[PDB]
Amino acid sequence: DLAPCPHGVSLRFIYDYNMEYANAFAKKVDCLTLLVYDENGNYVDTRIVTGTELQDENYRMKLDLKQGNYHFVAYGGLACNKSSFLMKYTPGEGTGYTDLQVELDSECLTNPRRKNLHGLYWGELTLATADLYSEGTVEMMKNTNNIRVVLQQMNGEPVDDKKFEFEITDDNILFSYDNNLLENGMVTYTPWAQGQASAGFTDEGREVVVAYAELSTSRLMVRDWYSPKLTVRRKADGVEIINIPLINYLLMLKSDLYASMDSQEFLDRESEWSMIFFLSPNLEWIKTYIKINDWTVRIN
């Protein structure tokens, strides 16, 4: 032979932090950024994977490393050209584990062709190396969300989407190294898709036509420094018919169906949201019952 035994790690990347409690990494993460830090948190290396090998569930990242204990950080949706977020380093400050920040590219808030955000995934792992590579799994979570807002008349008469403006105000486009949100100033999300949809027919054979808006946002978190808002405004008179604390309303679904689940876990595991608001003939919101993810929730 020539050399001593190969040494390092062999990493598996999974995304099972969803409501199905099942790995969807192969079908959801198309680009991977893997960062290597030493035991003290100092930068060592970066590995970027954008190929078809990510669709293989048997995929492992073999890393030849000097004997030691390492901390690995994985990002999904940062590497390919479709990406909505950027790695951010503070000029003058280091490149270590605790110096990394990820921010949304501000052009995604306004460019209609970029409003529907590319999935952002994150996970980390501390793992010591071994002869013939130690095995470790980087368990990842999804940071982006899709919220479909529906306006439906209680009597079944149509709702014209063009009569309304839909917004989500939040302060959630800057992430620290530990994937927590950093206060960076309020942003306004507007719909990437808006129109009308069918909700079936009335007993009089009349089609029920609803208004919808799809909004794509960054991480939904319970925190004491920001209360994200969902706002629905009538264009003609500027009246805000809906103005609610979005996170509180979603957690009314958790309290009903997933009472033992952690609030943050629920906000992270679920990434596909839908909310139906019922309107009176004057197009005012009937503040009694709504639908969250097809489940009827009492507000008061």
Total number of residues binding Mg ion (CB under 5 A)?
7
Taking the C-alpha atoms of residue 58 and residue 11, their distance in angstroms, rounded to an integer, is 11
Neighbour tally for 265: CB within 10 Å: 13
User: Which of the stretches 23-31, 35-43, 92-100, 173-181 binds Mg ion when contact is defined by CB under 5 A?
Assistant: 23-31
Taking the C-alpha atoms of residue 206 and residue 26, their distance in angstroms, rounded to an integer, is 43
Residue from 172, 175, 271, 292 touching Mg ion (CB under 5 A): that is: 271
Taking the C-alpha atoms of residue 277 and residue 231, their distance in angstroms, rounded to an integer, is 12
Taking the C-alpha atoms of residue 113 and residue 193, their distance in angstroms, rounded to an integer, is 10
Token digits for 300?
């008061």
User: Which of the stretches 80-88, 105-113, 185-193, 210-218 binds Mg ion when contact is defined by CB under 5 A?
Assistant: 80-88
DSSP state of 189: E
218 is a contact residue toward Mg ion (CB under 5 A): no
**Residue with smaller CB distance to Mg ion, 33 or 152:** 33
Would you say 5 is a known binding-site residue?
no
Would you say 18 is a known binding-site residue?
no
When computed from its CA atoms, the radius of gyration of the chain, rounded to whole angstroms, is 23
- For Mg ion, which residue has the nearest CB? 80
Q: Are 31 and 79 in contact (CB under 8 A)?
A: yes
80 is a contact residue toward Mg ion (CB under 5 A): yes
Q: Are 171 and 186 in contact (CB under 8 A)?
A: yes
170 is a contact residue toward Mg ion (CB under 5 A): no
**Residue with smaller CB distance to Mg ion, 129 or 145:** 145
Would you say 224 is a known binding-site residue?
no
User: Which of the stretches 168-176, 247-255, 263-271, 285-293 binds Mg ion when contact is defined by CB under 5 A?
Assistant: 263-271
Taking the C-alpha atoms of residue 268 and residue 122, their distance in angstroms, rounded to an integer, is 11
Residue from 30, 124, 161, 167 touching Mg ion (CB under 5 A): that is: 30
145 is a contact residue toward Mg ion (CB under 5 A): yes
> Where is the binding site, in residues?
30-31, 80, 118, 145, 267, 270
Residues that bind Mg ion (CB under 5 A): 30-31, 77, 80, 82, 145, 271
